Design a protein around this nucleic acid. Sequence first.
RNA 1: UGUCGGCUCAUCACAUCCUGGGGCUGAAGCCGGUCCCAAGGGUAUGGCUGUUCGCCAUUUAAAGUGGUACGCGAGCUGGGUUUAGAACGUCGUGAGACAGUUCGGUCCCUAUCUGCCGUGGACGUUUGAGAUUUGAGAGGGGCUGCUCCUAGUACGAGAGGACCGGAGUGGACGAACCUCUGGUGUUCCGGUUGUCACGCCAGUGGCAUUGCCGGGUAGCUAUGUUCGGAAAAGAUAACCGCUGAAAGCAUCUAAGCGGGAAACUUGCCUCAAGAUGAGAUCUCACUGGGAACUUGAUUCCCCUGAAGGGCCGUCGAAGACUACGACGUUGAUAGGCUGGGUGUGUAAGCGUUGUGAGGCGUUGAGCUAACCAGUACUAAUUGCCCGUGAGGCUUGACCA
RNA 2: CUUGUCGGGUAAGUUCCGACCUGCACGAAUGGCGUAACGAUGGCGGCGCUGUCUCCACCCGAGACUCAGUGAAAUUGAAA
RNA 3: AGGUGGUCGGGUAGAGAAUACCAAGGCGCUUGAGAGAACUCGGGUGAAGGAACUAGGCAAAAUGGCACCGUAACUUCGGG
RNA 4: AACCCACUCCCGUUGAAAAGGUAGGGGAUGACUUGUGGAUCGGAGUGAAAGGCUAAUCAAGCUCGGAGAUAGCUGGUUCUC
RNA 5: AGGGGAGUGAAAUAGAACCUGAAACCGUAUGCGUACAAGCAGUGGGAGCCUACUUGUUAGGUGACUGCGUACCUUUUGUAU
Lengths: 55, 120, 114, 211, 122
Amino acid sequence: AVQQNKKSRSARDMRRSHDALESNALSVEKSTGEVHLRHHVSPDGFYRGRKVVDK
Amino acid sequence: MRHRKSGRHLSRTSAHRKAMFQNMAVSLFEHELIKTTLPKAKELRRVAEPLITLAKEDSVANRRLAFDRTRSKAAVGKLFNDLGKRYANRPGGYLRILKCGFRAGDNAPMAYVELVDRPV
Amino acid sequence: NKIIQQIEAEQMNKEIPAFAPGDTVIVQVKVKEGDRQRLQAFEGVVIAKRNRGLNSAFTVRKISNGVGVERTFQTYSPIVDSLSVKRRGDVRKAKLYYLRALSGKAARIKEKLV
Amino acid sequence: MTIGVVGRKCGMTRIFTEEGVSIPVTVIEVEPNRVTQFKTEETDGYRAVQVTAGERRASRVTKAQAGHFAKANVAAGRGVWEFRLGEEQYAAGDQITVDLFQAGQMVDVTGESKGKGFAGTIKRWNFRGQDNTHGNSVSHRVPGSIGQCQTPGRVFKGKKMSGHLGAERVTVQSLEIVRVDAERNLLLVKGAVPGATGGDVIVRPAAKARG
Amino acid sequence: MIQTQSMLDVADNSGARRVMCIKVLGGSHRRYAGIGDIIKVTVKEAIPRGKVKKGQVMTAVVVRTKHGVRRTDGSIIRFDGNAAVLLNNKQEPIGTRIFGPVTRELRTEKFMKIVSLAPEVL
RNA sequence: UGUCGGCUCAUCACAUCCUGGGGCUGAAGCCGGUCCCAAGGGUAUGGCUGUUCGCCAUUUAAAGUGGUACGCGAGCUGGGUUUAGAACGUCGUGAGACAGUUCGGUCCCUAUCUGCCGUGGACGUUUGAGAUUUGAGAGGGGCUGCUCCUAGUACGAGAGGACCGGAGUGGACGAACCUCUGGUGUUCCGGUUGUCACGCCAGUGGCAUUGCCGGGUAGCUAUGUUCGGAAAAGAUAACCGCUGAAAGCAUCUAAGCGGGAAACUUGCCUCAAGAUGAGAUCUCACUGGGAACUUGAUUCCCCUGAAGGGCCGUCGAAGACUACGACGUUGAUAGGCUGGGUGUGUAAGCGUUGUGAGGCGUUGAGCUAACCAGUACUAAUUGCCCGUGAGGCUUGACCA
RNA sequence: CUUGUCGGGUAAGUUCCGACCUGCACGAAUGGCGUAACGAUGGCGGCGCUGUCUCCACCCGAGACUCAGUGAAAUUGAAA
RNA sequence: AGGUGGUCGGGUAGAGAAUACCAAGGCGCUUGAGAGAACUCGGGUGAAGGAACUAGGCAAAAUGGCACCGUAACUUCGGG
RNA sequence: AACCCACUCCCGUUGAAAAGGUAGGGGAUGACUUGUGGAUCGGAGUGAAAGGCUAAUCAAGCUCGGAGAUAGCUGGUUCUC
RNA sequence: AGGGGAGUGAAAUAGAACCUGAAACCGUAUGCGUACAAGCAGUGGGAGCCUACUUGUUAGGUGACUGCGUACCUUUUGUAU
Ligand SMILES: [Mg+2]
Ligand SMILES: [Mg+2]
Ligand SMILES: [Mg+2]
Ligand SMILES: [Mg+2]
Ligand SMILES: [Mg+2]
Ligand SMILES: [Mg+2]
Ligand SMILES: [Mg+2]
Ligand SMILES: [Mg+2]
Ligand SMILES: [Mg+2]
Ligand SMILES: [Mg+2]
Ligand SMILES: [Mg+2]
Ligand SMILES: [Mg+2]
Ligand SMILES: [Mg+2]
Ligand SMILES: [Mg+2]
Ligand SMILES: [Mg+2]
Ligand SMILES: [Mg+2]
Ligand SMILES: [Mg+2]
Ligand SMILES: [Mg+2]
Ligand SMILES: [Mg+2]
Ligand SMILES: [Mg+2]
Ligand SMILES: [Mg+2]
Ligand SMILES: [Mg+2]
Ligand SMILES: [Mg+2]
Ligand SMILES: [Mg+2]
Ligand SMILES: [Mg+2]
Ligand SMILES: [Mg+2]
Ligand SMILES: [Mg+2]
Ligand SMILES: [Mg+2]
Ligand SMILES: [Mg+2]
Ligand SMILES: [Mg+2]
Ligand SMILES: [Mg+2]
Ligand SMILES: [Mg+2]
Ligand SMILES: [Mg+2]
Ligand SMILES: [Mg+2]
Ligand SMILES: [Mg+2]
Ligand SMILES: [Mg+2]
Ligand SMILES: [Mg+2]
Ligand SMILES: [Mg+2]
Ligand SMILES: [Mg+2]
Ligand SMILES: [Mg+2]
Ligand SMILES: [Mg+2]
Ligand SMILES: [Mg+2]
Ligand SMILES: [Mg+2]
Ligand SMILES: [Mg+2]
Ligand SMILES: [Mg+2]
Ligand SMILES: [Mg+2]
Ligand SMILES: [Mg+2]
Ligand SMILES: [Mg+2]
Ligand SMILES: [Mg+2]
Ligand SMILES: [Mg+2]
Ligand SMILES: [Mg+2]
Ligand SMILES: [Mg+2]
Ligand SMILES: [Mg+2]
Ligand SMILES: [Mg+2]
Ligand SMILES: [Mg+2]
Ligand SMILES: [Mg+2]
Ligand SMILES: [Mg+2]
Ligand SMILES: [Mg+2]
Ligand SMILES: [Mg+2]
Ligand SMILES: [Mg+2]
Ligand SMILES: [Mg+2]
Ligand SMILES: [Mg+2]
Ligand SMILES: [Mg+2]
Ligand SMILES: [Mg+2]
Ligand SMILES: [Mg+2]
Ligand SMILES: [Mg+2]
Ligand SMILES: [Mg+2]
Ligand SMILES: [Mg+2]
Ligand SMILES: [Mg+2]
Ligand SMILES: [Mg+2]
Ligand SMILES: [Mg+2]
Ligand SMILES: [Mg+2]
Ligand SMILES: [Mg+2]
Ligand SMILES: [Mg+2]
Ligand SMILES: [Mg+2]
Ligand SMILES: [Mg+2]
Ligand SMILES: [Mg+2]
Ligand SMILES: [Mg+2]
Ligand SMILES: [Mg+2]
Ligand SMILES: [Mg+2]
Ligand SMILES: [Mg+2]
Ligand SMILES: [Mg+2]
Ligand SMILES: [Mg+2]
Ligand SMILES: [Mg+2]
Ligand SMILES: [Mg+2]
Ligand SMILES: [Mg+2]
Ligand SMILES: [Mg+2]
Ligand SMILES: [Mg+2]
Ligand SMILES: [Mg+2]
Ligand SMILES: [Mg+2]
Ligand SMILES: [Mg+2]
Ligand SMILES: [Mg+2]
Ligand SMILES: [Mg+2]
Ligand SMILES: [Mg+2]
Ligand SMILES: [Mg+2]
Ligand SMILES: [Mg+2]
Ligand SMILES: [Mg+2]
Ligand SMILES: [Mg+2]
Ligand SMILES: [Mg+2]
Ligand SMILES: [Mg+2]
Ligand SMILES: [Mg+2]
Ligand SMILES: [Mg+2]
Ligand SMILES: [Mg+2]
Ligand SMILES: [Mg+2]
Ligand SMILES: [Mg+2]
Ligand SMILES: [Mg+2]
Ligand SMILES: [Mg+2]
Ligand SMILES: [Mg+2]
Ligand SMILES: [Mg+2]
Ligand SMILES: [Mg+2]
Ligand SMILES: [Mg+2]
Ligand SMILES: [Mg+2]
Ligand SMILES: [Mg+2]
Ligand SMILES: [Mg+2]
Ligand SMILES: [Mg+2]
Ligand SMILES: [Mg+2]
Ligand SMILES: [Mg+2]
Ligand SMILES: [Mg+2]
Ligand SMILES: [Mg+2]
Ligand SMILES: [Mg+2]
Ligand SMILES: [Mg+2]
Ligand SMILES: [Mg+2]
Ligand SMILES: [Mg+2]
Ligand SMILES: [Mg+2]
Ligand SMILES: [Mg+2]
Ligand SMILES: [Mg+2]
Ligand SMILES: [Mg+2]
Ligand SMILES: [Mg+2]
Ligand SMILES: [Mg+2]
Ligand SMILES: [Mg+2]
Ligand SMILES: [Mg+2]
Ligand SMILES: [Mg+2]
Ligand SMILES: [Mg+2]
Ligand SMILES: [Mg+2]
Ligand SMILES: [Mg+2]
Ligand SMILES: [Mg+2]
Ligand SMILES: [Mg+2]
Ligand SMILES: [Mg+2]
Ligand SMILES: [Mg+2]
Ligand SMILES: [Mg+2]
Ligand SMILES: [Mg+2]
Ligand SMILES: [Mg+2]
Ligand SMILES: [Mg+2]
Ligand SMILES: [Mg+2]
Ligand SMILES: [Mg+2]
Ligand SMILES: [Mg+2]
Ligand SMILES: [Mg+2]
Ligand SMILES: [Mg+2]
Ligand SMILES: [Mg+2]
Ligand SMILES: [Mg+2]
Ligand SMILES: [Mg+2]
Ligand SMILES: [Mg+2]
Ligand SMILES: [Mg+2]
């Protein structure tokens, strides 16, 4: 099936009112000061104040 | 429904699923630290942890049982000789899983599986 | 399911001797035909079992008058008055459902000497 | 009716009478309930008593809800329920136990049933499927017609379609109490009780009974 | 459970070897007949000099089924084949001797005659 | 604007088929005939035929009559009709034709709007928040047989046989549940065929539909288990009245007072204050300055952001995504680990016996998913973001 | 006309098989009547077998569903 | 996922160039990760019944090899 | 079996495909299948005959001309008082 | 890749897809309106708010509430159809 009348500008923009994106949970590593995702290893290799992967 | 059901299909057949977790456990006992997807990392601890418990008692019966589950001669040698002696007094929980981010290619959540008391 | 185990365990006071599938047992069954009670007898070969505590059951099979009949007994019910093993059979399986297809000399079960 | 207890479904079992019959039984554990508030006509309109049961860690009870549980020296428990009583007296801090029931004593059990996520019309509404052979095209478990032509030319409200076999609340009426264990706080009930194991159930006297 | 077009045999000496259910009696839209339930049959195979002939429509009672009958303690009794007893117009058996075992659910006020004639009752 | 019949799913009328209440009877009883009131709930399976229909066979309390594009093909079918092939009978010189037969013959569409079934996001409800609630309104449900007692009584020449009133057990339908009886259980345990590999023997693994099979835990499930329809109240329909005149009588009606049905309003179950008419109860939190004015429900600056909510993480008999529920070290939320349980059915190695296949012992052995109980070994941080600073005015009454 | 009438088969058979003859409107090389073997040919009936069905239940893979990347179609006077 | 002439063609089972597992050799098919709803597609197993389904046993289930024994009407003497 | 064919079901129908696929199916030493080269054609060819085939076109191919055929038939026909 | 400066030029919003550079279509910013309201979306009436300035018998933007109101073409005896 297909539309009988084309949708308007307002009709299609009302449908997109639920398309806004969310923001993640970012924490600051207390020892150094790097910003990482919450509950994730730092981009440097730190988690909860400990080297874990040494790059 | 799937009330009180255990396991993950992971879009693979049973033979594929069983064969993939043998490779991961065999690689883990050799490198001590691997990077995989988070859902796969959580299904691996139900395979690689019962193998370390089995190696705490060394006998012909146990090594044959371990070789039937990890068909790798080096992994049976690594167990019974390095692990199981290192973890001789650990009441379970021999591996640690840490979220590390998402892959560039498809945005899949990744993880770091490692052994708890690595020599590093 | 920890306080279920205690409600059921205080009704588990019978003797229930040890027996296994393939054995020939005789079951004494309480029977009514009005006001007078009596103990009927069921004799057959055990083909199945179920070890679930109070919810245990077993199945025996007999040929009555040319017709085979199977009865499933609740072990801890007051109906099952007593049970005695008449002969010990030697089988490799746990459920002898294949015996339903065999009739005469084909359905013999080797006796367990010791 | 009008006064009962809140318990937890423990599971099903059986008990054997002396005469050999077996009674299918659902075990219900009723830890003693604590009267939290008494509602009267001159304060609230209707008339009822409010009840709490269980145990709650102090870090999960909020400040507003803790001062409510402290007006009556009751201590916080999981959940709060209200029983609309007819003509009864209960002071704040009282105890309500299984000891208000006897054997015989038809009772009504209210619970929240198991949830089947999103069900089709065969499972939900007991429809009957079309052919599995004889030429049917990809239309085996589908509903079929859902209306008529130009007249109405719309689907009537309340039509039976698919979706969410509920985890809703239901009551099973006229269930017989087989045994009441005062010391172990148990309530053995003949029949089946809605919900899964470990869920909250409300047990009240039979609404109808009569015969 | 017995429904229409189930082939069940005969536990009498009336003349039939093989009857077939054509109606389950005692209710609108009734589906199955258990042990002790009245059905309407037709005779598919007979004996040359018996007292029923092939193609006869008549009533019967189910006395033996593979599905079985439960008891109050939870037990079940199952047989290896479905059997029936043919009846005349007064709900009374036609044959004079009864083969095989029967059960105690026939001990009603209207079927005690076939309980007496049976070699064994379970 | 796709045309018969079947299937799935329905919705309304009453000119009622059954169940319910009555008047008359050429109504003795058990049965009926006919008319009135009543739409709550029910209201066959098959053989033949493309059939609707019909006729048969066996049931049922009964197998209602109609409207809805003769309801329903962007829901299914394609047997019939109504394209192209071929044949028969009949008609025509012929091409061909026949509400005359016979065999064969492609059924497309990812749902924008209304509608309907579920489920969320925003805002409002006049400070905000945690929790419990009343009920305007709406929906679901409402069927019924047989046997026994009363009683072989009332009725009747006899045969035959009740009303009213009580007990029991079923059929169909619905809901919940998994203790029992079974089903399934490619995540558990065994047997076995062909072949390849692990150096080789033993022992195991891959592939062959899970290779083929025998069993089977949890969960899900019916064919398994339990429960339901009511009683009762109010106002009534037809109908039956009491008292009573207009109209000395009679008369249920004109004034007045009653009885009365599965229909109507409650009683039973569920949803329900977006019921903008946004209700009620308990408890909790917040008690700083300065400036500019277009001079009060005003605007800006600094300080202070509580009660609480969310993000995040471990998950769940909750689930399409959400939402909902439990928990986050002062922790048993998940995995492991330690015991038990359950299922399968006497592992491997070794020792004996035999020439070997095999048997026997160590040995109900070994293994054992989802189950029960305990235990911080592993993962639930050492955070961030929203949400503020006592809640306008007018009038009345009690305080001051 | 017509589901002709009689018989067989089935609890019940507008189809099938055997007959009768009233052949609307058979008929002898647009051949008549038979016929073993043959047929992805039409009709009817049995045995075995079964999820075709009563009446569906569970399980396994691929979609559908969520996320990251690429990215159509028929249709459309305008739409509170 | 179509069509395209000819040649070579190993081991173990096997009548075989069928079929199963492999060799020499070649490849994992140019979106992936999750979750584990209705419904659709391709399959596995089902209690009691066994064509009651339907225009119609459509589809599915079943049979299936080698040796030996045994085999009807009918027949164009071959057969069946 | 290879090879040639196309009887049934389902899927697909905006297809992987302007005629396929998976399961079953028929012939398979012959009136067989097939490669290369050659011959016959538009009122003409070829046809174990279906009005079938003659370059995804057939009760008379395609292409360019007569040609802007003809259309008592549909549609459309533009600024102001 | 593309940009921010700096240089050339009378002029780079003449910068190489380079004169002018419209409309459909897609954005950012400001003012007012909009979450108890039913329909060809306009018009008659009309409050409040915002801006400008000749400070309200003025100009511009918005339009709460309300009466009336079923597009255009064609073809027709007749179309919201
Ligand atoms: Mg339109
Ligand atoms: Mg239109
Ligand atoms: Mg916009
Ligand atoms: Mg969107
Ligand atoms: Mg779980
Ligand atoms: Mg496999
Ligand atoms: Mg669920
Ligand atoms: Mg059906
Ligand atoms: Mg069909
Ligand atoms: Mg199709
Ligand atoms: Mg299909
Ligand atoms: Mg409906
Ligand atoms: Mg007959
Ligand atoms: Mg109406
Ligand atoms: Mg009427
Ligand atoms: Mg009626
Ligand atoms: Mg009536
Ligand atoms: Mg009457
Ligand atoms: Mg009457
Ligand atoms: Mg009606
Ligand atoms: Mg009605
Ligand atoms: Mg009705
Ligand atoms: Mg009512
Ligand atoms: Mg009929
Ligand atoms: Mg037919
Ligand atoms: Mg009509
Ligand atoms: Mg009609
Ligand atoms: Mg119609
Ligand atoms: Mg109709
Ligand atoms: Mg339609
Ligand atoms: Mg269709
Ligand atoms: Mg149709
Ligand atoms: Mg349509
Ligand atoms: Mg269509
Ligand atoms: Mg469709
Ligand atoms: Mg067809
Ligand atoms: Mg047709
Ligand atoms: Mg033709
Ligand atoms: Mg002629
Ligand atoms: Mg054909
Ligand atoms: Mg036809
Ligand atoms: Mg269609
Ligand atoms: Mg939609
Ligand atoms: Mg539209
Ligand atoms: Mg619309
Ligand atoms: Mg109400
Ligand atoms: Mg409303
Ligand atoms: Mg109602
Ligand atoms: Mg209703
Ligand atoms: Mg008499
Ligand atoms: Mg039922
Ligand atoms: Mg069960
Ligand atoms: Mg169980
Ligand atoms: Mg069982
Ligand atoms: Mg079982
Ligand atoms: Mg099983
Ligand atoms: Mg089970
Ligand atoms: Mg080798
Ligand atoms: Mg070997
Ligand atoms: Mg092998
Ligand atoms: Mg291999
Ligand atoms: Mg298998
Ligand atoms: Mg096989
Ligand atoms: Mg159910
Ligand atoms: Mg008077
Ligand atoms: Mg009077
Ligand atoms: Mg009056
Ligand atoms: Mg009254
Ligand atoms: Mg009443
Ligand atoms: Mg009733
Ligand atoms: Mg009504
Ligand atoms: Mg509110
Ligand atoms: Mg409120
Ligand atoms: Mg806080
Ligand atoms: Mg909360
Ligand atoms: Mg979840
Ligand atoms: Mg364990
Ligand atoms: Mg065990
Ligand atoms: Mg051993
Ligand atoms: Mg083994
Ligand atoms: Mg041994
Ligand atoms: Mg021993
Ligand atoms: Mg502890
Ligand atoms: Mg005719
Ligand atoms: Mg005829
Ligand atoms: Mg005939
Ligand atoms: Mg037929
Ligand atoms: Mg004939
Ligand atoms: Mg001649
Ligand atoms: Mg001639
Ligand atoms: Mg001719
Ligand atoms: Mg002729
Ligand atoms: Mg001839
Ligand atoms: Mg002939
Ligand atoms: Mg041929
Ligand atoms: Mg038949
Ligand atoms: Mg699936
Ligand atoms: Mg996407
Ligand atoms: Mg080879
Ligand atoms: Mg091959
Ligand atoms: Mg190689
Ligand atoms: Mg994928
Ligand atoms: Mg399927
Ligand atoms: Mg199968
Ligand atoms: Mg199995
Ligand atoms: Mg079956
Ligand atoms: Mg069976
Ligand atoms: Mg059979
Ligand atoms: Mg039929
Ligand atoms: Mg039928
Ligand atoms: Mg077939
Ligand atoms: Mg098959
Ligand atoms: Mg070829
Ligand atoms: Mg051809
Ligand atoms: Mg064809
Ligand atoms: Mg074909
Ligand atoms: Mg197939
Ligand atoms: Mg072939
Ligand atoms: Mg093929
Ligand atoms: Mg041949
Ligand atoms: Mg040429
Ligand atoms: Mg030429
Ligand atoms: Mg030409
Ligand atoms: Mg022709
Ligand atoms: Mg030609
Ligand atoms: Mg062509
Ligand atoms: Mg021409
Ligand atoms: Mg030309
Ligand atoms: Mg022209
Ligand atoms: Mg000219
Ligand atoms: Mg015009
Ligand atoms: Mg102009
Ligand atoms: Mg410019
Ligand atoms: Mg340009
Ligand atoms: Mg110039
Ligand atoms: Mg330019
Ligand atoms: Mg522009
Ligand atoms: Mg804006
Ligand atoms: Mg309103
Ligand atoms: Mg408003
Ligand atoms: Mg509107
Ligand atoms: Mg409107
Ligand atoms: Mg206006
Ligand atoms: Mg104006
Ligand atoms: Mg103005
Ligand atoms: Mg207006
Ligand atoms: Mg208007
Ligand atoms: Mg026009
Ligand atoms: Mg016209
Ligand atoms: Mg006209
Ligand atoms: Mg209109
Ligand atoms: Mg229009
Ligand atoms: Mg008009």
